[PDB]
Amino acid sequence: TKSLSVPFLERPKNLDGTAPGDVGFDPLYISDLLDIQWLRESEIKHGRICMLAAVGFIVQEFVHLPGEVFSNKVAIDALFQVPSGGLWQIFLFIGLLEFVMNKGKMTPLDMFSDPNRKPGDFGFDPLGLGKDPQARKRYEVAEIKNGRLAMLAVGGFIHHMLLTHQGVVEQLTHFRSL
Amino acid sequence: AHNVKIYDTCIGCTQCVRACPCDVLEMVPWDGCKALQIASAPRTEDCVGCKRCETACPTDFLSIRVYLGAETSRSMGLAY
Amino acid sequence: MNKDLLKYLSTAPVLGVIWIAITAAIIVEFNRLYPDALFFPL
Amino acid sequence: EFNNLIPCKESKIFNKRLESTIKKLENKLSKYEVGSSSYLAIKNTINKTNNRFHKYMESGVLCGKDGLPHLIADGRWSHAGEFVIPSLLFIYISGWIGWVGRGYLSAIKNTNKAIENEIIIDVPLALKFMSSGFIWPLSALREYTKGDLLMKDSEVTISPR
Amino acid sequence: MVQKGSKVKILRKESYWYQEIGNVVTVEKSGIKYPIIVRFDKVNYAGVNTNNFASEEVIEIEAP
Amino acid sequence: RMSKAIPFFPKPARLDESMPGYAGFDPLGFSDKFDVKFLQEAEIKHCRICMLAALGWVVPEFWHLPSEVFSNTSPLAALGQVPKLGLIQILLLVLALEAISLDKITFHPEKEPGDFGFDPLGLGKGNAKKWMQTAELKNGRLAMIAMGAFFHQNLLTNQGIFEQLRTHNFFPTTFPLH
Ligand code: CLA
Ligand code: CLA
Ligand code: CLA
Ligand SMILES: CC1=C(/C=C/C(C)=C/C=C/C(C)=C/C=C/C=C(C)/C=C/C=C(C)/C=C/C2=C(C)C[C@@H](O)CC2(C)C)C(C)(C)C[C@H](O)C1
């Protein structure tokens, strides 16, 4: 009857230990307030963005596109340096992706209207890495664990940059304390 | 005197008669409803126009209706 | 968390006050950090 | 046009308002000791006042002969921030509140707790609707064309005529 | 045919529930001027949710 | 079942493959509420106006009437320059033509949308009707988009389309106009 990760709390009813990444961690019982399918989708999506963003923060410190506009090795400062017109094109393209990927079903009321729709699963496996059922099941957990880690990392990266105004690697090499 | 009329939607519940503080109303035999009775207003010269009868009536719209009219000492409720 | 207590926290006036207080706080905090916005800056 | 108005940065009355406001605050400041909490409070008001006047000066908002900002709300885009953009923001938010509230009402009518859920909110159900408000314009438009937005006149009660 | 369990639309204009739908509760024998008893979800201004109607004053929507 | 244009949306209920210019594209579902024949008439009328307007927008840059008054290659500027008596005559023609369209939709609802019996050369008579009907709509739809471009761009530049392309006046430096 108890949570696995927090053994002194009753297990949340919507966490049945089936979904990848489930160790019954929900001490605030958020999964009682909000729909678990929507929560799971949201978790994976936050993870995938942060995985890219983490890689983005590092690569942007070293590699750049041509021009002084696409310089700046601090990622938070680079946001305000690059052309604003370019940011709009990214935004509107993401909008199109969000619409197409979700087949125009973009809210907790309708996103999981089709029974076959599963959280995070857009049927995207070009190289066929998850052909093996057993391997795919491991990868599902790895995706979520890496996404979870990247979320916390990007939280760090951003707050470190706000505090120092140095790059990720720049800060490590020239570590200055508070 | 005030005019009191009873319409044919009456279900013979007796609540208007019971509500009336001036004994204006009474129940009389009828065929039109399951209760086999209808409200009647034989003594409207004693009606003060308080409309307690209408408050009591359960039908929609009302089956008893009070139209306020020519005032008398009785209808104005004067003890002087 | 206790279901009866949670039911009480779901009553109209309790949710009313909490939600209005959060909304009010948001407006206060916007005006505390970005004061005197007569118009959208552009 | 707007010959009766002038940019607030070009306005002598608008500038005099700054001077007179600050002059009053500096008189108030002189009554307190440097470093005291009172002194610092007055200094913050002086800084905040300066920031406000300079912000309006740099904005290109027009000033009247009173030396106060006057807003133009006729639709011209050079004053979009004064009314049109606030308006779009208001409509988006207010439409959201209305749309999610309408959605919740309809959901609970299809239950046995149609009345109970009005005075004791089903909070999970409410949050589901509240979360879904961001595309209310499209939702509302489709609902209208589907014939699901409105009841027929013959299906709503009316009084005698 | 209107009978117990029928959904009916109300056509009496002075009714609180004019043009609304109620549920038939019973139909009285014959000779009764208003034999169809209907129940509603909404209460009227007097607080009642039931009233008697004639056949002319109602029209059936659903079957039972 | 599904729309051709948007494969993850349902087919519009009141449109069919038999209709000219059908791609099953009606996501907002205006064909469900409004009369389809009326929408078809409306679409064709817009199509025809914009095709003439688009061509009329560009032809003066190559050749214009022999005078100083008809020499303004910016079309919205030209509107202010040309004789008012001339514009009045254009207006009266338009009013006359709309009187005929009004008469069609009011007193002759049997007639096909856009059908004024105007085919001097018999181009879409026999076994080319479906084709030409589609070609009319496709070219009209293109012109409608083109007129959106032409009008708004002229507002910015106060130039004709070819004058804008030639001078490379691609970006708005003039907004806001007022
Ligand atoms: C036109 C552009 C567009 C469109 C149509 C969509 C559409 C969608 N997005 Mg996407 N998104 C976009 C751009 C877009 N997105 C961009 C540019 C990013 C950054 C990469 C994202 C990142 C993103 C995330 C992380 C998530 C979505 C989700 C969604 C879905 C729910 C949207 C919603 O309810 O938002 C309305 C907004 C709200 C209800 C509240 C958030 C308010 C703002 C926008 C951001 C909050 C920031 C703040 C710091 C949050 C933390 C505060 C505190 C708790 C610590 C919907 C399919 C969600 C989803 O799929 O869940 C299942 C989801 O979790 N999107
Ligand atoms: C979801 C709730 C909702 C919606 C969609 C509407 C919509 C409307 N109202 Mg109604 N109204 C409401 C609640 C709502 N109202 C409430 C609670 C009251 C009592 C104060 C009223 C009292 C009222 C009056 C007196 C009038 C309207 C009118 C209208 C119409 C025009 C807009 C307007 O004047 O609003 C004005 C309404 C207000 C200023 C009241 C405040 C609205 C509150 C803040 C909304 C409550 C939201 C709810 C608590 C959210 C919970 C959702 C959550 C559980 C998911 C429009 C159909 C007018 C009309 O008939 O035009 C044809 C009109 O004269 N309304
Ligand atoms: C301008 C008028 C116009 C009209 C009346 C139509 C009408 C139609 N189109 Mg066509 N279409 C148009 C332009 C138009 N289209 C353009 C420019 C394109 C190129 C993208 C297309 C591409 C297209 C395809 C691929 C298909 C259609 C189809 C259809 C039919 C079904 C969809 C529908 O109901 O749209 C009605 C929608 C609108 C009129 C747009 C909505 C307008 C906004 C949201 C409201 C406000 C607009 C504006 C501000 C009002 C100004 C008023 C004025 C006084 C200034 C219907 C006959 C389908 C069909 O079956 O063909 C037979 C179909 O498959 N259209
Ligand atoms: C200006 C000009 C230049 C021209 C600039 C030009 C050519 C460069 C354009 C660069 C573009 C193509 C980059 C594209 C940007 C790609 C973005 C960043 C992708 C966003 C991905 C998201 C973040 C997905 C998130 C999500 C995922 C993870 C999962 C989904 O479920 C949900 C969503 C939410 C979609 C130069 C270079 C010539 C120099 C000169 O000096 C000036």
Ligand SMILES: CC1=C(/C=C/C(C)=C/C=C/C(C)=C\C=C\C=C(C)\C=C\C=C(C)\C=C\C2=C(C)CCCC2(C)C)C(C)(C)CCC1
């Ligand atoms: C632009 C502009 C202007 C003007 C404007 C105008 C003039 C307007 C009008 C408008 C109009 C004339 C309108 C109308 C309308 C109508 C109707 C008929 C409506 C309806 C609606 C509805 C039905 C809705 C519903 C809803 C939603 C959608 C959301 C949520 C809630 C609800 C449910 C309520 C000005 C100058 C001021 C300023 C500048 C700009």
Ligand SMILES: CCCCCCCCCCCCO[C@@H]1O[C@H](CO)[C@@H](O[C@H]2O[C@H](CO)[C@@H](O)[C@H](O)[C@H]2O)[C@H](O)[C@H]1O
């Ligand atoms: C002339 C002006 C040109 C500019 C027009 C720009 C608009 C472009 C339209 C894109 C297509 C929109 O199509 C519209 O999508 C939304 C989803 O976003 C659908 O909406 C559906 O899903 C949303 C959320 O997923 C639900 O809240 C809603 O109840 C449901 O109807 C509509 O059923 C569909 O009609």
